[PDB]
């Protein structure tokens, strides 16, 4: 609401990995890959 709490946001290189393996070593997986950097062009001042 309103118009206080402080939160922290991650940035940089991030990986998440959830593998699953079969008897033939087949891999079923979900992977998240994120690369982010701070951009001065779109930063505001409040």
């Amino acid at each position: 609401a309103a118009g206080q709490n402080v939160t922290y946001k991650d940035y940089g290189i991030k990986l998440e990995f959830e593998p699953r393996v079969d008897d033939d070593n087949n891999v079923s997986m979900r992977v998240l890959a994120d690369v982010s950097d701070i951009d001065p062009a779109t930063s505001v001042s409040l």
């Binding site: 609401a1 309103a2 118009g3 079923s28 982010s36 951009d39 779109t42 505001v44």
Partner: protein, 51 residues
């Protein structure tokens, strides 16, 4: 007292402009049947959004 006081003014314009813009975006993905894949190549901007 009978008379008149009046006049005219003018402005000259000779503006001329042209513009072109081209873009192609070719993203490619891979996913398994029954699954889902999301892709973003861009940025994020902060927005004020509160109840």
């Amino acid at each position: 007292n009978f008379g008149i006081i009046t006049g005219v003014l003018s402005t000259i314009n000779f503006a001329l402009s042209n513009g072109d813009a081209y873009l192609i975006a070719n993203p490619q993905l891979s996913a398994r049947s029954g699954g889902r894949t999301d892709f973003l190549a861009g940025g994020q901007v902060p927005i004020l959004q509160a109840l």
